Design a protein around this ligand. Sequence first.
Ligand code: 1Z8
Length: 468
Amino acid sequence: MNTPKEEFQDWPIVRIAAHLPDLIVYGHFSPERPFMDYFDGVLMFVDISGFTAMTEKFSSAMYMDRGAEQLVEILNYHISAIVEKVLIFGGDILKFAGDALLALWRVERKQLKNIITVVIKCSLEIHGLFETQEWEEGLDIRVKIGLAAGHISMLVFGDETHSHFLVIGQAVDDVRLAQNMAQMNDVILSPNCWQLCDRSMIEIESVPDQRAVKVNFLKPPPNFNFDEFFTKCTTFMHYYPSGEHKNLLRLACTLKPDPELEMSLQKYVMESILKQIDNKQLQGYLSELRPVTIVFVNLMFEDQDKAEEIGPAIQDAYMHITSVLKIFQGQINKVFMFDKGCSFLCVFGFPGEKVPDELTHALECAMDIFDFCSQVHKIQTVSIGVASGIVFCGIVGHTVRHEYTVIGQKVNLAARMMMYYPGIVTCDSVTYNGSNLPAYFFKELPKKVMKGVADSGPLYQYWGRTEK
Ligand SMILES: FC(F)(F)c1n[nH]cc1-c1ccccc1
Protein backbone atom coordinates (compact mmCIF):
# COMPACT_ATOMS: atom_id res chain seq x y z
CA MET A 1 0.00 0.00 0.00
CA ASN A 2 1.01 3.60 -0.54
CA THR A 3 2.16 5.65 2.44
CA PRO A 4 1.10 9.28 1.70
CA LYS A 5 2.95 11.58 4.13
CA GLU A 6 2.08 14.84 6.05
CA GLU A 7 -0.08 14.85 9.15
CA PHE A 8 -2.73 17.61 8.85
CA GLN A 9 -1.60 20.29 11.31
CA ASP A 10 -3.90 23.23 10.48
CA TRP A 11 -6.77 22.53 12.88
CA PRO A 12 -8.60 25.29 14.81
CA ILE A 13 -7.05 24.04 18.06
CA VAL A 14 -3.52 24.51 16.57
CA ARG A 15 -4.42 28.01 15.34
CA ILE A 16 -5.75 28.88 18.82
CA ALA A 17 -2.55 27.50 20.42
CA ALA A 18 -0.41 29.95 18.35
CA HIS A 19 -1.93 32.73 20.53
CA LEU A 20 -0.86 31.06 23.82
CA PRO A 21 2.34 29.99 25.61
CA ASP A 22 3.12 26.35 26.44
CA LEU A 23 2.55 27.39 30.09
CA ILE A 24 -1.17 27.50 29.16
CA VAL A 25 -1.42 25.05 26.23
CA TYR A 26 0.09 22.21 28.26
CA GLY A 27 -0.98 23.53 31.69
CA HIS A 28 -3.94 21.18 32.42
CA PHE A 29 -5.05 23.14 35.52
CA SER A 30 -8.36 23.51 37.48
CA PRO A 31 -11.03 25.75 35.78
CA GLU A 32 -11.42 27.33 39.31
CA ARG A 33 -10.73 31.06 39.49
CA PRO A 34 -8.36 32.39 40.68
CA PHE A 35 -5.90 29.56 40.07
CA MET A 36 -2.33 29.93 41.25
CA ASP A 37 0.77 27.85 40.63
CA TYR A 38 4.40 28.31 41.66
CA PHE A 39 7.62 27.24 39.90
CA ASP A 40 11.14 28.44 39.12
CA GLY A 41 12.51 29.75 35.88
CA VAL A 42 14.58 32.16 33.86
CA LEU A 43 12.74 35.16 32.37
CA MET A 44 13.81 37.16 29.34
CA PHE A 45 12.21 40.55 28.73
CA VAL A 46 12.95 41.88 25.20
CA ASP A 47 12.13 45.58 24.89
CA ILE A 48 10.84 46.09 21.34
CA SER A 49 10.01 49.83 22.00
CA GLY A 50 12.31 50.68 19.07
CA PHE A 51 10.10 48.61 16.71
CA THR A 52 6.66 49.59 18.05
CA ALA A 53 7.76 53.29 17.88
CA MET A 54 7.21 52.82 14.07
CA THR A 55 3.37 53.37 14.47
CA GLU A 56 3.69 57.08 14.04
CA LYS A 57 5.93 56.93 10.85
CA PHE A 58 3.36 54.47 9.31
CA SER A 59 0.68 57.04 10.08
CA SER A 60 2.20 59.27 7.29
CA ALA A 61 0.19 60.00 4.08
CA MET A 62 3.31 58.55 2.36
CA TYR A 63 1.93 55.01 3.17
CA MET A 64 -1.16 55.77 1.07
CA ASP A 65 -3.78 54.12 3.29
CA ARG A 66 -1.70 50.90 3.70
CA GLY A 67 0.11 52.09 6.84
CA ALA A 68 -1.36 49.31 9.05
CA GLU A 69 -0.59 46.58 6.51
CA GLN A 70 2.98 47.83 6.00
CA LEU A 71 3.49 48.21 9.77
CA VAL A 72 2.27 44.66 10.63
CA GLU A 73 4.45 43.26 7.81
CA ILE A 74 7.71 44.93 8.89
CA LEU A 75 7.05 44.41 12.66
CA ASN A 76 6.28 40.70 12.09
CA TYR A 77 9.33 40.32 9.88
CA HIS A 78 11.67 41.47 12.74
CA ILE A 79 9.61 40.09 15.66
CA SER A 80 9.37 36.61 13.91
CA ALA A 81 13.20 36.42 13.93
CA ILE A 82 13.26 37.14 17.74
CA VAL A 83 10.51 34.55 18.32
CA GLU A 84 12.39 31.90 16.32
CA LYS A 85 15.53 32.55 18.41
CA VAL A 86 13.62 32.20 21.66
CA LEU A 87 11.85 29.05 20.51
CA ILE A 88 14.96 27.31 19.10
CA PHE A 89 16.78 28.06 22.41
CA GLY A 90 13.93 26.27 24.25
CA GLY A 91 12.04 29.28 25.64
CA ASP A 92 8.26 29.79 25.97
CA ILE A 93 7.04 33.18 24.72
CA LEU A 94 4.54 34.14 27.48
CA LYS A 95 3.13 37.38 26.12
CA PHE A 96 3.59 40.24 23.68
CA ALA A 97 2.91 43.83 24.59
CA GLY A 98 3.29 46.87 22.22
CA ASP A 99 6.67 47.50 23.88
CA ALA A 100 7.95 43.99 24.97
CA LEU A 101 8.01 40.19 24.56
CA LEU A 102 8.39 38.17 27.79
CA ALA A 103 9.79 34.64 27.52
CA LEU A 104 10.19 31.93 30.17
CA TRP A 105 12.45 28.91 30.56
CA ARG A 106 10.71 26.92 33.29
CA VAL A 107 13.07 24.42 34.98
CA GLU A 108 13.75 22.82 38.35
CA ARG A 109 15.94 24.96 40.73
CA LYS A 110 19.06 22.75 40.18
CA GLN A 111 18.97 23.57 36.50
CA LEU A 112 18.65 27.38 36.82
CA LYS A 113 22.43 27.81 36.62
CA ASN A 114 22.82 26.00 33.27
CA ILE A 115 19.61 27.44 31.79
CA ILE A 116 20.85 31.01 32.51
CA THR A 117 23.84 30.22 30.26
CA VAL A 118 21.45 29.07 27.47
CA VAL A 119 19.33 32.25 27.98
CA ILE A 120 22.39 34.54 27.86
CA LYS A 121 23.54 32.91 24.64
CA CYS A 122 20.03 33.34 23.19
CA SER A 123 20.05 37.06 24.31
CA LEU A 124 23.38 37.67 22.53
CA GLU A 125 22.12 35.98 19.38
CA ILE A 126 18.95 38.15 19.47
CA HIS A 127 21.18 41.30 19.61
CA GLY A 128 23.11 39.68 16.73
CA LEU A 129 19.97 39.77 14.52
CA PHE A 130 19.98 43.59 14.55
CA GLU A 131 23.75 44.30 14.50
CA THR A 132 23.78 45.82 10.95
CA GLN A 133 20.08 46.87 10.53
CA GLU A 134 18.03 50.16 10.28
CA TRP A 135 15.34 51.86 8.11
CA GLU A 136 15.74 55.44 6.62
CA GLU A 137 19.05 55.88 8.65
CA GLY A 138 16.86 55.44 11.82
CA LEU A 139 19.29 55.46 14.83
CA ASP A 140 18.06 52.24 16.53
CA ILE A 141 16.15 49.32 15.15
CA ARG A 142 17.78 47.50 18.18
CA VAL A 143 16.47 45.89 21.41
CA LYS A 144 17.28 45.88 25.15
CA ILE A 145 17.15 42.66 27.13
CA GLY A 146 16.69 42.08 30.82
CA LEU A 147 17.10 38.61 32.39
CA ALA A 148 15.88 37.41 35.79
CA ALA A 149 15.78 34.02 37.51
CA GLY A 150 14.12 32.60 40.53
CA HIS A 151 10.70 31.95 41.97
CA ILE A 152 7.75 32.65 39.65
CA SER A 153 4.02 32.53 40.44
CA MET A 154 1.33 32.16 37.80
CA LEU A 155 -2.16 33.51 38.24
CA VAL A 156 -5.08 32.49 36.01
CA PHE A 157 -8.27 34.49 36.50
CA GLY A 158 -11.51 34.84 34.58
CA ASP A 159 -15.09 33.71 34.41
CA GLU A 160 -16.98 30.95 32.60
CA THR A 161 -16.23 32.36 29.12
CA HIS A 162 -12.86 34.23 29.37
CA SER A 163 -9.50 33.49 31.00
CA HIS A 164 -6.34 35.60 31.48
CA PHE A 165 -3.04 34.72 33.00
CA LEU A 166 -0.17 36.71 34.59
CA VAL A 167 3.16 35.76 36.04
CA ILE A 168 4.11 37.56 39.24
CA GLY A 169 6.74 37.67 42.00
CA GLN A 170 10.25 39.03 42.57
CA ALA A 171 11.82 37.51 39.39
CA VAL A 172 8.98 39.10 37.33
CA ASP A 173 9.55 42.50 39.05
CA ASP A 174 13.35 41.96 38.54
CA VAL A 175 13.13 41.33 34.83
CA ARG A 176 11.22 44.61 34.39
CA LEU A 177 13.86 46.45 36.50
CA ALA A 178 16.79 44.76 34.58
CA GLN A 179 15.31 45.69 31.17
CA ASN A 180 14.77 49.38 32.10
CA MET A 181 18.48 49.67 33.20
CA ALA A 182 19.48 48.30 29.79
CA GLN A 183 20.62 50.55 26.98
CA MET A 184 20.11 49.35 23.39
CA ASN A 185 22.17 46.17 22.70
CA ASP A 186 22.53 45.45 26.45
CA VAL A 187 21.85 42.22 28.32
CA ILE A 188 21.22 43.08 32.01
CA LEU A 189 21.04 40.33 34.65
CA SER A 190 18.91 40.78 37.79
CA PRO A 191 20.85 40.57 41.10
CA ASN A 192 19.40 37.06 41.72
CA CYS A 193 20.20 36.01 38.11
CA TRP A 194 23.78 37.12 38.61
CA GLN A 195 23.91 35.23 41.99
CA LEU A 196 22.57 32.00 40.40
CA CYS A 197 24.48 32.12 37.09
CA ASP A 198 27.59 30.27 35.98
CA ARG A 199 30.16 33.07 36.54
CA SER A 200 32.87 31.12 34.59
CA MET A 201 30.81 31.64 31.46
CA ILE A 202 30.63 35.40 31.49
CA GLU A 203 32.42 38.70 32.00
CA ILE A 204 30.13 41.34 33.53
CA GLU A 205 30.31 44.93 34.63
CA SER A 206 28.60 46.82 37.44
CA VAL A 207 25.58 48.99 36.83
CA PRO A 208 25.98 52.17 38.98
CA ASP A 209 23.69 52.33 42.10
CA GLN A 210 22.39 48.82 41.20
CA ARG A 211 23.15 45.23 42.21
CA ALA A 212 22.05 44.16 38.68
CA VAL A 213 24.91 43.53 36.21
CA LYS A 214 25.58 44.02 32.48
CA VAL A 215 26.91 41.04 30.42
CA ASN A 216 29.97 42.22 28.51
CA PHE A 217 30.87 38.83 27.00
CA LEU A 218 29.99 35.16 27.09
CA LYS A 219 33.50 33.65 27.24
CA PRO A 220 33.10 29.95 28.01
CA PRO A 221 35.88 27.60 29.28
CA PRO A 222 38.36 26.19 26.72
CA ASN A 223 36.74 22.73 26.34
CA PHE A 224 33.16 24.08 26.29
CA ASN A 225 30.90 23.16 23.32
CA PHE A 226 27.60 25.11 23.28
CA ASP A 227 25.78 22.54 21.13
CA GLU A 228 26.69 19.60 23.43
CA PHE A 229 25.86 21.79 26.48
CA PHE A 230 22.47 22.80 24.96
CA THR A 231 21.69 19.10 24.22
CA LYS A 232 22.34 18.29 27.91
CA CYS A 233 20.03 21.17 28.88
CA THR A 234 17.18 19.81 26.68
CA THR A 235 16.85 16.89 29.15
CA PHE A 236 15.09 19.42 31.39
CA MET A 237 12.97 20.98 28.58
CA HIS A 238 9.66 19.14 28.66
CA TYR A 239 8.28 20.36 25.32
CA TYR A 240 11.41 20.92 23.24
CA PRO A 241 10.56 19.63 19.68
CA SER A 242 12.47 16.40 19.15
CA GLY A 243 12.73 13.12 17.22
CA GLU A 244 10.17 13.06 14.39
CA HIS A 245 9.16 16.59 15.43
CA LYS A 246 12.66 18.17 15.62
CA ASN A 247 11.79 20.24 12.42
CA LEU A 248 8.95 22.11 14.23
CA LEU A 249 9.33 25.33 16.18
CA ARG A 250 6.65 24.28 18.73
CA LEU A 251 5.27 20.97 19.97
CA ALA A 252 1.94 22.94 19.95
CA CYS A 253 1.96 22.65 16.10
CA THR A 254 1.22 18.91 16.66
CA LEU A 255 -1.92 19.43 18.82
CA LYS A 256 -4.81 17.31 17.64
CA PRO A 257 -8.54 18.11 17.99
CA ASP A 258 -9.71 17.75 21.57
CA PRO A 259 -12.96 19.64 22.28
CA GLU A 260 -12.39 19.81 26.11
CA LEU A 261 -8.88 21.31 25.50
CA GLU A 262 -10.10 23.68 22.82
CA MET A 263 -12.95 24.84 25.08
CA SER A 264 -10.34 25.74 27.69
CA LEU A 265 -7.85 27.44 25.32
CA GLN A 266 -10.36 29.52 23.33
CA LYS A 267 -11.34 31.39 26.59
CA TYR A 268 -7.96 33.25 26.33
CA VAL A 269 -8.52 34.47 22.81
CA MET A 270 -10.76 37.35 21.67
CA GLU A 271 -13.92 36.35 19.76
CA SER A 272 -12.90 38.35 16.62
CA ILE A 273 -9.62 36.30 16.55
CA LEU A 274 -11.58 33.05 16.89
CA LYS A 275 -13.77 34.25 13.98
CA GLN A 276 -10.66 34.54 11.79
CA ILE A 277 -9.34 31.19 13.05
CA ASP A 278 -12.68 29.62 12.03
CA ASN A 279 -12.30 31.12 8.50
CA LYS A 280 -15.44 33.28 9.10
CA GLN A 281 -13.58 36.53 8.62
CA LEU A 282 -10.78 37.58 6.27
CA GLN A 283 -7.25 36.91 7.58
CA GLY A 284 -6.31 40.59 7.05
CA TYR A 285 -9.40 42.16 8.72
CA LEU A 286 -7.83 42.85 12.16
CA SER A 287 -4.69 44.72 10.86
CA GLU A 288 -5.83 48.32 11.04
CA LEU A 289 -5.10 51.87 12.10
CA ARG A 290 -8.29 52.43 14.09
CA PRO A 291 -9.57 55.28 16.35
CA VAL A 292 -10.07 53.80 19.78
CA THR A 293 -10.25 54.85 23.42
CA ILE A 294 -7.68 53.17 25.65
CA VAL A 295 -8.67 52.74 29.33
CA PHE A 296 -5.54 51.60 31.14
CA VAL A 297 -6.37 50.35 34.68
CA ASN A 298 -3.62 49.92 37.26
CA LEU A 299 -4.27 48.06 40.55
CA MET A 300 -1.62 48.46 43.28
CA PHE A 301 -1.28 46.08 46.25
CA GLU A 302 0.61 46.36 49.59
CA ASP A 303 2.40 43.18 48.37
CA GLN A 304 3.63 42.66 44.75
CA ASP A 305 4.66 38.97 44.85
CA LYS A 306 2.34 37.10 47.24
CA ALA A 307 -0.09 35.64 44.71
CA GLU A 308 -2.16 34.27 47.61
CA GLU A 309 -3.49 37.78 48.46
CA ILE A 310 -3.32 39.52 45.10
CA GLY A 311 -4.96 36.62 43.17
CA PRO A 312 -8.46 36.90 44.78
CA ALA A 313 -8.23 40.73 44.52
CA ILE A 314 -7.43 40.57 40.76
CA GLN A 315 -10.21 37.98 40.27
CA ASP A 316 -12.71 40.29 42.05
CA ALA A 317 -11.55 43.34 40.02
CA TYR A 318 -11.70 41.27 36.80
CA MET A 319 -15.36 40.19 37.46
CA HIS A 320 -16.31 43.84 37.77
CA ILE A 321 -14.19 45.12 34.87
CA THR A 322 -15.60 42.50 32.50
CA SER A 323 -19.25 43.38 33.50
CA VAL A 324 -18.56 47.10 32.91
CA LEU A 325 -16.76 46.52 29.56
CA LYS A 326 -19.59 44.16 28.38
CA ILE A 327 -22.10 46.96 28.49
CA PHE A 328 -20.05 49.06 25.96
CA GLN A 329 -18.25 46.26 24.04
CA GLY A 330 -14.89 47.22 25.62
CA GLN A 331 -12.28 44.49 25.54
CA ILE A 332 -9.36 43.61 27.75
CA ASN A 333 -6.47 43.48 25.28
CA LYS A 334 -3.70 42.63 27.81
CA VAL A 335 -3.14 42.21 31.51
CA PHE A 336 0.34 42.26 32.99
CA MET A 337 2.45 43.31 35.97
CA PHE A 338 4.13 46.80 35.96
CA ASP A 339 6.19 47.74 39.10
CA LYS A 340 4.04 45.85 41.75
CA GLY A 341 0.80 46.86 39.96
CA CYS A 342 -1.57 44.76 37.92
CA SER A 343 -2.49 46.62 34.70
CA PHE A 344 -5.47 46.01 32.40
CA LEU A 345 -5.18 47.44 28.89
CA CYS A 346 -8.82 48.00 27.96
CA VAL A 347 -9.89 49.14 24.51
CA PHE A 348 -13.14 50.76 23.35
CA GLY A 349 -13.73 50.71 19.57
CA PHE A 350 -11.94 47.43 18.57
CA PRO A 351 -12.94 46.11 15.03
CA GLY A 352 -16.67 45.39 14.72
CA GLU A 353 -17.24 46.87 18.21
CA LYS A 354 -17.80 50.57 17.21
CA VAL A 355 -19.85 52.65 19.72
CA PRO A 356 -21.04 56.25 18.88
CA ASP A 357 -20.36 58.06 22.30
CA GLU A 358 -17.20 56.02 22.87
CA LEU A 359 -15.85 58.99 25.02
CA THR A 360 -18.58 59.73 27.69
CA HIS A 361 -19.01 55.94 27.95
CA ALA A 362 -15.21 55.29 28.29
CA LEU A 363 -15.05 57.94 31.11
CA GLU A 364 -18.15 56.56 32.85
CA CYS A 365 -16.71 53.04 32.56
CA ALA A 366 -13.40 54.22 33.97
CA MET A 367 -15.13 55.86 36.97
CA ASP A 368 -17.28 52.75 37.57
CA ILE A 369 -14.14 50.57 37.54
CA PHE A 370 -12.25 53.06 39.74
CA ASP A 371 -15.06 53.19 42.35
CA PHE A 372 -15.59 49.42 42.49
CA CYS A 373 -11.91 48.38 42.51
CA SER A 374 -11.12 50.99 45.16
CA GLN A 375 -13.40 48.99 47.54
CA VAL A 376 -11.85 45.59 46.65
CA HIS A 377 -10.12 43.87 49.61
CA LYS A 378 -6.30 44.28 49.38
CA ILE A 379 -6.39 46.78 46.51
CA GLN A 380 -4.42 49.75 47.90
CA THR A 381 -4.60 52.21 44.94
CA VAL A 382 -6.48 52.24 41.62
CA SER A 383 -5.26 54.49 38.84
CA ILE A 384 -6.84 54.81 35.39
CA GLY A 385 -5.55 56.59 32.31
CA VAL A 386 -7.91 57.27 29.41
CA ALA A 387 -6.47 58.36 26.05
CA SER A 388 -8.12 58.41 22.60
CA GLY A 389 -6.70 58.47 19.11
CA ILE A 390 -5.42 56.32 16.28
CA VAL A 391 -3.72 53.14 17.27
CA PHE A 392 -2.38 50.21 15.24
CA CYS A 393 -4.17 46.93 15.91
CA GLY A 394 -3.07 43.62 14.57
CA ILE A 395 -1.85 40.12 15.18
CA VAL A 396 1.86 40.54 15.93
CA GLY A 397 4.59 37.87 16.14
CA HIS A 398 5.46 34.64 14.31
CA THR A 399 3.09 32.28 12.43
CA VAL A 400 3.54 29.77 15.28
CA ARG A 401 3.38 32.29 18.18
CA HIS A 402 1.58 35.63 17.89
CA GLU A 403 -1.04 37.70 19.67
CA TYR A 404 -3.40 40.50 18.87
CA THR A 405 -1.76 43.68 19.99
CA VAL A 406 -2.57 47.38 20.13
CA ILE A 407 0.35 49.81 19.65
CA GLY A 408 0.55 53.56 19.55
CA GLN A 409 1.37 56.85 21.25
CA LYS A 410 -2.12 56.90 22.84
CA VAL A 411 -1.57 53.47 24.40
CA ASN A 412 1.81 54.64 25.87
CA LEU A 413 0.11 57.90 27.04
CA ALA A 414 -2.72 56.11 28.94
CA ALA A 415 -0.03 53.78 30.49
CA ARG A 416 2.12 56.73 31.65
CA MET A 417 -0.91 58.74 32.89
CA MET A 418 -1.97 55.88 35.21
CA MET A 419 1.59 55.71 36.67
CA TYR A 420 2.30 59.46 36.93
CA TYR A 421 -1.17 60.41 38.23
CA PRO A 422 -1.85 57.54 40.66
CA GLY A 423 -5.15 57.14 42.56
CA ILE A 424 -7.32 59.09 40.12
CA VAL A 425 -9.03 58.73 36.72
CA THR A 426 -7.17 60.82 34.12
CA CYS A 427 -7.94 61.58 30.49
CA ASP A 428 -6.24 63.28 27.56
CA SER A 429 -7.41 66.34 25.62
CA VAL A 430 -9.12 64.32 22.85
CA THR A 431 -11.29 62.56 25.45
CA TYR A 432 -12.01 65.69 27.50
CA ASN A 433 -13.00 67.84 24.46
CA GLY A 434 -14.86 65.10 22.61
CA SER A 435 -17.03 64.01 25.63
CA ASN A 436 -18.84 67.47 25.51
CA LEU A 437 -19.53 66.67 29.25
CA PRO A 438 -19.68 69.82 31.39
CA ALA A 439 -16.21 71.19 32.12
CA TYR A 440 -16.80 70.94 35.94
CA PHE A 441 -16.86 67.09 35.64
CA PHE A 442 -13.09 67.49 35.23
CA LYS A 443 -10.06 69.04 36.82
CA GLU A 444 -7.26 70.39 34.57
CA LEU A 445 -4.02 68.85 35.86
CA PRO A 446 -0.43 70.06 36.28
CA LYS A 447 1.81 69.06 33.36
CA LYS A 448 4.20 66.20 34.22
CA VAL A 449 7.25 65.11 32.25
CA MET A 450 6.44 61.48 31.41
CA LYS A 451 9.15 59.05 30.17
CA GLY A 452 8.42 58.20 26.55
CA VAL A 453 5.78 60.87 25.84
CA ALA A 454 6.65 64.04 23.90
CA ASP A 455 3.95 66.64 24.75
CA SER A 456 0.96 64.76 26.24
CA GLY A 457 -1.21 67.87 25.63
CA PRO A 458 -3.39 69.23 28.50
CA LEU A 459 -4.34 66.38 30.84
CA TYR A 460 -7.43 66.19 33.04
CA GLN A 461 -8.72 64.29 35.97
CA TYR A 462 -12.23 63.01 35.49
CA TRP A 463 -13.65 64.20 38.80
CA GLY A 464 -17.12 62.91 38.01
CA ARG A 465 -20.72 64.17 38.22
CA THR A 466 -20.63 65.68 41.74
CA GLU A 467 -18.27 67.67 44.02
CA LYS A 468 -18.52 64.59 46.30
F1 1Z8 B 1 3.28 37.70 30.90
C1 1Z8 B 1 2.50 38.49 31.62
F2 1Z8 B 1 1.70 37.73 32.23
F3 1Z8 B 1 1.76 39.19 30.75
C2 1Z8 B 1 3.24 39.36 32.55
N1 1Z8 B 1 3.15 39.08 33.85
N2 1Z8 B 1 3.92 40.02 34.44
C3 1Z8 B 1 4.47 40.86 33.54
C4 1Z8 B 1 4.06 40.46 32.30
C5 1Z8 B 1 4.43 41.12 31.03
C6 1Z8 B 1 4.53 40.40 29.84
C7 1Z8 B 1 4.88 41.04 28.66
C8 1Z8 B 1 5.10 42.39 28.65
C9 1Z8 B 1 4.99 43.12 29.81
C10 1Z8 B 1 4.65 42.49 31.00
